[PDB]
Each structure stands twice: as structure tokens, then as C-alpha cells.
DNA sequence: AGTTTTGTTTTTTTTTT
DNA sequence: AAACAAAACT
RNA sequence: AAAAAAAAA
DNA sequence: TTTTTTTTTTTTTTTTTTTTTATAAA
DNA sequence: AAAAAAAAAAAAAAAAAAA
DNA sequence: AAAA
């Protein structure tokens, strides 16, 4: 079966003939004899030939040369069988040569073009160094099967029908109850779109929209059953975006697909952590052509807008703008509840759906659309794309004959999650609305559910009629849906207040009984919040540091080992931050840090100090993760949420209340309380509140009365107000305290506002009046907003808090550190302005886009490299002598530059610069720093220079501690290495124009220098010319 | 007039189902 | 995380 | 070896 | 009820003690 | 020579007792 | 060397 070839896409002649055939292709064929469904299919199809044609003459091409020469050379040998001549044999020679140079080249720039990508690559977080700290990817291969006859069997064959029979039967049966699903889908109370809405759905497909989509496509994704990628489609989108219109445009108005919309490739992956002997234990992925993804994905991108109307916020899964936390927090209250309250009679229960997407009945679901409301063009291509959809099955490479596909969605299909969930909405209305299943009570608050996809827990009280009743319920809706409950899976906390109730409870229910602990989402749930720091925060403290255990002998540099620590790492760390962010000891920290750092620091003492790691300025942009401002930053997040009072964030409400149960509405711009027994038993919301407030005196704010104060806050409801004053006031003019205006603006600042001066109730503008024109009142107000106070007050999305809050926590946290460069500059005698220590600075990001380069200059800067007068102190001997044995102290400056060792190399590069016609001071601090005097600093010649230098660098360094002098030629071979990798990469960039600026003065000297017997012995010959 | 800072856009990996 | 664009301040 | 949402660099 | 005083915890600053054996390439 | 860790002080908040 |  063929596959597109990506490469084959790049190249001058292979675009330009096949854009040709694109246009030839429609321009003929487009006629009133067929349907754009069927036009379609056979355009794919002429598109396939002319690619392998292409692909074969390209192939063809390219070994010319090498079919001539051994023609001709074969030639000449056969006549040699018979007579043997002396002139043949040296021709023979002579060709033969040639066609062993020619089988080297191809050899090397294979070679070189592969370690020129993995030069930009090195050290960096891409799928290199991911790979590294990987396994090898376990290949997908059916050798053993357990069989229908409880045997073990590995006949290939009877894999094949096995797996296929199973396969088969799972999709094949379809419900046929019809009257039923209606009785059900009347029984209970569901939403509507109106007709505005559904207008919305049914409007037409437009060339825009589908630009939009195809510039969105994930890049490097396996190819559908046709073989075509999503890099053709975005190659030829010009063309194309005309002629997939037409189609749309047709499917619209006929309801009718092409016949390969409906063609899908399954593959077997295995499940983790399960047998993969059983056929039971493997999930189906499908893959599905691109042109039938860019429909579906149309499809859901237009009904996700509306979806917040049809699903409830107990749904956090595959929703926009939700988090998976919420139902973290949400069930962690509900269980302090239970701990707390003296009669116990409550139980907390986790669902898992069996095979959700695969079991789903396709006409529930389609009767389900239509009691919503979707009706018309959009429910009719739905109809049209489950109608007969099939699938192959790829079993150890080779392709099964193809089954329906009469149950299910795809799992693979961008629209399956959402329709999913609208199935899945039906039954959790249902739950709600019915009052004989008793939810537990939280203050104003009932909790019955939370779900996340196909995954539910249930909150319960009085079990013993509570569950009975649900089981019925969910009974009732798979003789419906198809919905099945996963046995294997399902857990459940039980409270009662004597051994014999629990006993007879176990009795009646289905499910098991969890002492301890239940994982949920990701963290474990405890049955007494107690003990919820030992089992989550313990447990990763332990995985980490067998984790950085196992990497101890990578190889890779500190660079490299930093980056290992933010990839891997840091995801899973804020994660626990965000879903339980309780109050933890600061030996948490402790031990983390010194874990981290024993680990990138290979078990040996630091060489640069975390302290300098810490600012992005400082070291080349190389930093080190600060884990304690990180969850400071989680922590006082939640302020954002108690500003916003949204009414979807039920999470928040359900923490115990005795006193003040609104309190957090209150506390964020807003006025102090003198009562201080509130939050007495808070989780979370009190070590946020202390958070913040310590941030706030720490930067001097008076966080109480501000530019963002509130009308409907607790400073104007001290004065006796009525809300239809309050209400009216929002409703009319705006949010904040500010919007009114204060002092001499009072209501004076626009016309609308002085229009509603008069429409207030008399007694309470004259209160008004006195606050707002207030002295302090004009001051607190009047003043600019800070950065820390515009981040929790003016955005609108949650989107990316963790990462504004703590970019400010290091500004407000920076520290004092020693600079390394002072310490170079008291080496030498010289004073270096602020202006030097910047250019030093940008120096040690910009000299490479290599992390290689880069680290090679950020070594010599700060100061990296041993020396014997610092052994000699460390050893507490006399003998600070230079190792290489000049009999001089070895000083760092000795070491890099005034060693008579050392000496005739860099005059060598000096000779090198005069005949760049350069010319440069010889001053140590423009190569070792990359600091220029000023008549220098507007020069053009900087990029060369700084290739120069880091390879003579690189020559010293490989050489420290040995006592004979580095060579010119090692020079040139590192000098002629980074001209190679630097070489391959700017011509697949196509920077190549400032490649030849940089590079092409400078190889002409080196080739002028070197010997015909160097140049052969070491490969150094021009890419450019 | 030049340099520095802020914000958006393109590219990586990890978390859940 | 990088690079480019845009606006303000030295 | 595919999909959806979220997070960070 | 309000104000004052004492106790505990956390953060910042300064001093004192200890280190690794060469490096880049891999 | 340089980095890290430990030690000591200072500052604020919380709780109790008296004005 | 640490990708397709
Ligand atoms: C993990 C994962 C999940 N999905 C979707 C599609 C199904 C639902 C539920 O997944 P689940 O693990 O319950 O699997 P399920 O089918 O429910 O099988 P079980 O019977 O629950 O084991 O999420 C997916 O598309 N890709 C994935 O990699
Ligand atoms: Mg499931
Ligand atoms: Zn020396």
C-alpha cells in the first residue's frame, strides 16, 4: 500500500509537475456527466499514479552516472577475458577509482547531513533529548494469543481469524428498540437550542473556514488509508481550497459522502499494564483519510460553540476552558464534610464506562440530536457520516478484509468526544432531577456528580435507598444507550456509624470497598483528608529521586542535565501543586532542591552558583527551576477565581462555613474584617488568603481600597444602600468604584453617567456622594495600578496565570550575587563600564544558535575551568605551579592566554586576522569575553571572528592540564567541523545568503594554507564553490 | 536616533480521558 | 523557548 | 500510533 | 470590646567551613 | 578560591489578659 | 549521539 514520502514534497521539479497535473486534472474532467462525490475519487487517484511516476524517474535520475560507468567499465574487463591488454587495464583503473570516490561521497554527506541536524538539536527540550531518557519504542507485533479454547497459540493464521472474529463481533450489533428511546428521551427534562442557535449549525460551509482548518493540522501524522498527509494539503491549498468547496458545498445540498469518507485503518495498542496475551486488553485507534477529517472537524468546531448551553458544569472533560482540578477540590471538600459531621451515613462512589466510545448505540444518539433541537443541513451529514462506515484491520503489517461498523464512534475522530458527552449529559440529567437518589447537602449547596469524559464519582447520602435507586436508573439507560459500567474498575467509600450497618450494606451493593485510598484523575483521593500529604506529596518525593537515580550516567552536559529536570520533571510537580495545593514543610523543598542538583551536577560541587542560574539575564539564558516560587504562584492563583464570582465555580463554594459563608467574594480589593475566626478548618482557601497578603506588604501595596475596588463590595454596603441602587449602577455604568468616578468626577465624567445622576433613590446618592468625594477616598483611588495588581483585576482568561504570577515572584524575590565578570576584569588591570558587562552579557547568548557553542563561551566567562592555583588552595599545598610545566603560577590568565604554550597559537589566529585584513588589539578580552574596544563595535567582521575564537577555545580546552603546546591544525579541523554542520543546516533553513557573507571570506584562507597532502588526509574541501 | 522591553506567534514536551 | 514587531525612554 | 481539552517552557 | 504584650515561626544576612584531582567527547 | 549551609536576629501575627 |  503506498504512502506519500514527505521528501518528495520539497523539491523544484516534483512541485511544479505535479501543481501542473492539479489544474490540468479539473479543468478537463469537470463536466455535467458526474457528481463531485465520485470527481473526487478519481482526482485522488490520477494524483497517486503521478506521484510514484515521479518518484521512479527522480530515482532513476540520480544513479545515471553510476549506471555508465559500471557499463563501461564491465566493458572493457569483458574483452580483458579473452585478450588481456596492458592500456585497458590502466583505463579500468582509472574508472574504477572514480567509481569508489563517487560511492564515498554519497557515504559522508549521508553521514553529515545527519549529525548537521543534531547539532542544532543537542541539549535542547526536542524529541533528541526526550529520547534519550526514553526507551526504545516496543514494536507493534501479535506473536501469541490466548484462545477461544483457553489455549496458547502463536499458528500466525489463527491470529488473524482470532483477533478479526473479535473485532468483528464487538461492532456488529445494533438496538433496534426504537419506542423505547423515546419513552426514555420523554421521561426527563432536557435543554433547547433556540432559533438563533440553530441557525448558527445550519449556516454554509465557506472558503475561509476551511483555510483555517487546514493551517491548523498537526504536522507529522501517519497518512489515512489513501496515503495522503496533511503536509500535501497545506502544500497545494491554493489549488485545492476551490475544489473543496465545491465538494462541501455538494454534501451540503445531497447529504451524500464519497465512498472513501467512510474507509479507516484500525491498529492494535496495546493497553499499559495489562496482559497483552488476552485480545481483550488492546484499544482501537483508527486512522481516517485527512479530506474526511477536515469535515468532521468543521462539524465539531460549530457545535463546541453552543456546548456550554447543552452540558452542565458538573462536565469538566474535552470542555473548553475548564479544568480537571475543580473536580479535584470539589470532591476533596465533600469528603471533609463526611469526616466532620457526627452522624454518618454517606458514600462516595467511582464509575468507569466499559468501552465507552465502542459501545455507544448510533440511533440514541441521533434521536438525542434531534430532542435538542439540531435539525437540517447539520443533523442530516451527521446522519450521513455513521451510515455505513467500515474498517481494516492492520495485523502485523498486513491489511484483514473490512468489517461495518455498526455500533460506536471512531475513537480517532475529531467529533467523537463531543457527541460522547451529549450522550453522557442525557443520563446526567437525569441523575439531578431525580430527588429519590439523595445527594449530600453543603451549607446552601447539593453535590449529586462530577464527570470528566466518560469517568464519574458520585456523592451519596442515605446509601442503602440511594444506591438502589441509581443502579436502576443506570439499568434503564443501557437498555437504551448501549452504556455498559466497568465491574473491574468501580470503588467506593462507605461511612456508617456501626460495623453492622456497613456489613449489611456490602451485602446489597455491587461494588468494593476501599480502606484507604482511591486513585482519581491522576492523585489519590484518602478517606480522611489527613492523611492526604503522605500518601500524594511522600509518594513523588520517592519516584524522583529513583527516577534521577536510574539517568546518573547519561551522557550529556549540565546544559543538557537542566533541561532533563524542567521536560520531565517539572509537568508532574505542578501538577500535584495545582490539583491539592495544602500548606506543605519546607523540608519538601529542601529535599527536592538538593535531589535536583546532585543530580545535575553529576555528585560533584557546584562549578557556577544556583544563585547566578537563577536570572534568564545572567549565564547565556541557561536558568535553573525555582520549585518554592513555583508553588507560591499555584497557590495564590485562586485569588483570580474569588475576584471573578463566577457562578460555574461551584469548587470554591463548598468549603465549611460557620461564620460568613460569602466571606471570599469579599476579601480580594476590597475592605479588612475584624472578625478572625473564619476559614478555622480551610484546606486551601486560607493559606492562599496569608499568601497573598504577605505579597501584598511585601511590595507596600494597600491592597484594602484601589483602582479596582468594586460598587457591589463591602465598603459601599457599610453605607445603607438599597440593592436597586447598587444593581442599577452596574447595570448602567460599569464594574469598579473608578467607572463612577471620585472626588471632583464624581458622577461628572461622561453624559450617560450624568443622566443617571438624577435616577438614583434621593437618600442614597446623598450617602454616595459623601464616600466617593471623600479625601482618602480620592487618594487610595486615584492611584496607578502596579503590574501584580493588573494580572488578578484585568484579565479575562485564566489561561497562563501560573506563568504571569511567577515571572513577577522573581522580580519581587531577585537576589544579590557576585559577578564572575568583575572577578575577570580584577585579572586583569582594567575597569569594564555597565556598558562592557552588557555586551558580555549578549555576547554569551548570541555567539551560536548551538547549545555546544554556547556552552563552550559560557564556561569561559564564568569562570568554569580548575586551575592550580585554585588546587593548590583546595589541597592546602605550596604547589600552585602551572601543570603544563613553564614553571610559572597558574593563574586563569595564565591558563587561557600569557602560557608560552599557548602563546603560538593565538599568534597564529592573529596571523589568520591579518590576512582577513582585519585588525584587532591583541587583548585577551575580545576573545576569551567577546568584549571590543569602541573604534571596533560598529563593525561588521563580529560573526567570523566569533567562530575564530571558540574553536581556539575549543582547541586549549581539550588540551588543559598537558604540557605541549596546542597545534594550528587541530584548529582548522574544529574550525572546518563547525563549517560543515553549520553548512547542511543553513541550506535546509535557506539562510544560506548570510551563510556565504560569514563563511566565504574566511575558507579561502584557510584552503590557501593547508598542503593537497593535508587537505586529502583530513576531507577539507569547499561546500560552497 | 538607538536600544530596550513587551506582546504575539511558532515550536517543543507533559497531564488527564 | 525564540524571534520579530511596536512603542516608549534614555 | 490516532483524537480532545489543559499546563509549562 | 479594644489595646497591649508575649511567644512562635519564617526569612534574610553574615560568617564559617569544605571542596577534588583536566578537559572535551560521548 | 568559591559555594553552601548554618546560625542568629528581627519582624509580624496570633492569642491571651487587663484596662 | 540522543529522529524520523
Ligand atoms: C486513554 C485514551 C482515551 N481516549 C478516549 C476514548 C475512550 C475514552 C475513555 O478512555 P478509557 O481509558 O476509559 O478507555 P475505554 O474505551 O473506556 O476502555 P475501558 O473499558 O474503560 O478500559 O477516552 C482516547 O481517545 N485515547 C486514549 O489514549
Ligand atoms: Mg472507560
Ligand atoms: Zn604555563
Not at 479507516?264 to 499499559?272: G, Q, R
Not at 499494564?273 to 460549530?302: C, Q, V, W, Y
Not at 509537568?571 to 495545593?581: C, D, Q, S, T
Request: proline fraction near 4%.
Amino acid at each position: 500500500t503506498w504512502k506519500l514520502n514527505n521528501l518528495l514534497l520539497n523539491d523544484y521539479w516534483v512541485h511544479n509537475e505535479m501543481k501542473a497535473e492539479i489544474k490540468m486534472f479539473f479543468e478537463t474532467n469537470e463536466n455535467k456527466d458526474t457528481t463531485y462525490q465520485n470527481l473526487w475519487d478519481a482526482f485522488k487517484a490520477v494524483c497517486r499514479g503521478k506521484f510514484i511516476a515521479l518518484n521512479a524517474y527522480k530515482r532513476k535520475q540520480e544513479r545515471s552516472k553510476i549506471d555508465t560507468l559500471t557499463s563501461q567499465l564491465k566493458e572493457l574487463e569483458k574483452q580483458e577475458q579473452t585478450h588481456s591488454k596492458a592500456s585497458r587495464r590502466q583505463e579500468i583503473t582509472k574508472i574504477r577509482a572514480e567509481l569508489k570516490e563517487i560511492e564515498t561521497q554519497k557515504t559522508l554527506q549521508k553521514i553529515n547531513e545527519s549529525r548537521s541536524w543534531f547539532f542544532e538539536r543537542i541539549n535542547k527540550i526536542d524529541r533528541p533529548l526526550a529520547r534519550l531518557i526514553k526507551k526504545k519504542r516496543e514494536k507493534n507485533q501479535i506473536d501469541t494469543i490466548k484462545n477461544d479454547k483457553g489455549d496458547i497459540t502463536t499458528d500466525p493464521t489463527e491470529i488473524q481469524t482470532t483477533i478479526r472474529e473479535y473485532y468483528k463481533h464487538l461492532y456488529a450489533n445494533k438496538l433496534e428498540n426504537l419506542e423505547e428511546m423515546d419513552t426514555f428521551l420523554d421521561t426527563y427534562t432536557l435543554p433547547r437550542l433556540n432559533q438563533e442557535e440553530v441557525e448558527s449549525l445550519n449556516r454554509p460551509i465557506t472558503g475561509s473556514e476551511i483555510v483555517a482548518i487546514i493551517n491548523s493540522l498537526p504536522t507529522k501524522k501517519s497518512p489515512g488509508p489513501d496515503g495522503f498527509t496533511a503536509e500535501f494539503y497545506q502544500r497545494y491549498k491554493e489549488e485545492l481550497v476551490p475544489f473543496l468547496l465545491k465538494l462541501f458545498q455538494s454534501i451540503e445540498k445531497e447529504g451524500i459522502l464519497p465512498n472513501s469518507f467512510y474507509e479507516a485503518s484500525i491498529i492494535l495498542i496495546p493497553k499499559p499494564g495489562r496482559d497483552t496475551t488476552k485480545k481483550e486488553n488492546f484499544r482501537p485507534i483508527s486512522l481516517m483519510n485527512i479530506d474526511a477529517k477536515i469535515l468532521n472537524k468543521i462539524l465539531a468546531n460549530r457545535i463546541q460553540q453552543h456546548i456550554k448551553k447543552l452540558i452542565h458544569h458538573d462536565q469538566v472533560g474535552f470542555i473548553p476552558g475548564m479544568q480537571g482540578w475543580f473536580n479535584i477540590r470539589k470532591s476533596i471538600n465533600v469528603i471533609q464534610h463526611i469526616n466532620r459531621a457526627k452522624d454518618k451515613n454517606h458514600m462516595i462512589i467511582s464509575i468507569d464506562a466499559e468501552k465507552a466510545f465502542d459501545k455507544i448505540q448510533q440511533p440514541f444518539m441521533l434521536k438525542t440530536l434531534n430532542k435538542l433541537g439540531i435539525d437540517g443541513t447539520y443533523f442530516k451529514i451527521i446522519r450521513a457520516i455513521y451510515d455505513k462506515p467500515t474498517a481494516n484491520i492492520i495485523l502485523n503489517g498486513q491489511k484483514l478484509e473490512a468489517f461495518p461498523l455498526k455500533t460506536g464512534t471512531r475513537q480517532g475522530c475529531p467529533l467523537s468526544p463531543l457527541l460522547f458527552n451529549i450522550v453522557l449529559e442525557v443520563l446526567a440529567r437525569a441523575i439531578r432531577q431525580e430527588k429519590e437518589i439523595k445527594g449530600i447537602q453543603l451549607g446552601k449547596e447539593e453535590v449529586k456528580l462530577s464527570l470528566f469524559a466518560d469517568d464519574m464519582i458520585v456523592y451519596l447520602e442515605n446509601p442503602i435507598v440511594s444506591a438502589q435507586n441509581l443502579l436502576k436508573l443506570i439499568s434503564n439507560f443501557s437498555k437504551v444507550s448501549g452504556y455498559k459500567i466497568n465491574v473491574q474498575k468501580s470503588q467506593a467509600f462507605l461511612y456508617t456509624n456501626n460495623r453492622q450497618t456497613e456489613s449489611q450494606i456490602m451485602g446489597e451493593l455491587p461494588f468494593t470497598i476501599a480502606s484507604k485510598r482511591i486513585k482519581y484523575l491522576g492523585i489519590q483521593l484518602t478517606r480522611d483528608v489527613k492523611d492526604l500529604f503522605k500518601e500524594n506529596y511522600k509518594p513523588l518525593l520517592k519516584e524522583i529521586k529513583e527516577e534521577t537515580n536510574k539517568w546518573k550516567n547519561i551522557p550529556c552536559s549540565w546544559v543538557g542535565r537542566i533541561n532533563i529536570v524542567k521536560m520531565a520533571i517539572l509537568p508532574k510537580v505542578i501538577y500535584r501543586f495545582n490539583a491539592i495545593p495544602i500548606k506543605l514543610p519546607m523540608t519538601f523543598f529542601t529535599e527536592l532542591e538538593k535531589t535536583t542538583l546532585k543530580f545535575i551536577w553529576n555528585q560533584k560541587r557546584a562549578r557556577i552558583a544556583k544563585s547566578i542560574l537563577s536570572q534568564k539575564n545572567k549565564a547565556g539564558g541557561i536558568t535553573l527551576p525555582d520549585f518554592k516560587l513555583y508553588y507560591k504562584a499555584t497557590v495564590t492563583k485562586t485569588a483570580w477565581y474569588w475576584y471573578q464570582n463566577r457562578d460555574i465555580d461551584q469548587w470554591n463554594r463548598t468549603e465549611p462555613s460557620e461564620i460568613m459563608p460569602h466571606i471570599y467574594n469579599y476579601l480580594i480589593f476590597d475592605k479588612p474584617e475584624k472578625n478572625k475566626q473564619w476559614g478555622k478548618d480551610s484546606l486551601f482557601n486560607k493559606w492562599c488568603w496569608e499568601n497573598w497578603l504577605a505579597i501584598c506588604r511585601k511590595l507596600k501595596l494597600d491592597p484594602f481600597l484601589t483602582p479596582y475596588t468594586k460598587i457591589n463590595s463591602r465598603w459601599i454596603k457599610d453605607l445603607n444602600v438599597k440593592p436597586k441602587t447598587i444593581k442599577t449602577l452596574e447595570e448602567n455604568l460599569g464594574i469598579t468604584i473608578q467607572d463612577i468616578g471620585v472626588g471632583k468626577d464624581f458622577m461628572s465624567k461622561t453624559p450617560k453617567a450624568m443622566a443617571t445622576k438624577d435616577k438614583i433613590d434621593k437618600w442614597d446618592l446623598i450617602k454616595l456622594k459623601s464616600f466617593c468625594t471623600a479625601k482618602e477616598t480620592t487618594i487610595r483611588v486615584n492611584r496607578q495600578p502596579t503590574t501584580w495588581e493588573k494580572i488578578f483585576a484585568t484579565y479575562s482568561s485564566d489561561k497562563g496565570l501560573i506563568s504571569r504570577i511567577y515571572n513577577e515572584l522573581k522580580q519581587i524575590y531577585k537576589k544579590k550575587t557576585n559577578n564572575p565578570i568583575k572577578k575577570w576584569a580584577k585579572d586583569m588591570n582594567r575597569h569594564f563600564s555597565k556598558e562592557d558587562i552588557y555586551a558580555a552579557k549578549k555576547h554569551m547568548k548570541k555567539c551560536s544558535s548551538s547549545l555546544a557553542i554556547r556552552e563552550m563561551q559560557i564556561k569561559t566567562t564564568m569562570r568554569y575551568h580548575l586551575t592550580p592555583v585554585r588546587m593548590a588552595i583546595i589541597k592546602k599545598s605550596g604547589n600552585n605551579r602551572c601543570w603544563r610545566g613553564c614553571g610559572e603560577i597558574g593563574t586563569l590568565l595564565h591558563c587561557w592566554w600569557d602560557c608560552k604554550l599557548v602563546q603560538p597559537l593565538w599568534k597564529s589566529v592573529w596571523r589568520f586576522l591579518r590576512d582577513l585584513e582585519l585588525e584587532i588589539p591583541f587583548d585577551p578580552a575580545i576573545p576569551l569575553l567577546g568584549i571590543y574596544p569602541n573604534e571596533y563595535k560598529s563593525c561588521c567582521y563580529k560573526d567570523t571572528c566569533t567562530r575564530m575564537f571558540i574553536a581556539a577555545l575549543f582547541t586549549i580546552a581539550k588540551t588543559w592540564n598537558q604540557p605541549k603546546c596546542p597545534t594550528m591544525i587541530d584548529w582548522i579541523k574544529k574550525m572546518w567541523h563547525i563549517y560543515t554542520m553549520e553548512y547542511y543546516a543553513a541550506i535546509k533553513n535557506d539562510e544560506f545568503i548570510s551563510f556565504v557573507g560569514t563563511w566565504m571570506k574566511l575558507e579561502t584562507i584557510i584552503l590557501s594554507k593547508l598542503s593537497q597532502e593535508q587537505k586529502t588526509k583530513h576531507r577539507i574541501f569547499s561546500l560552497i564553490g
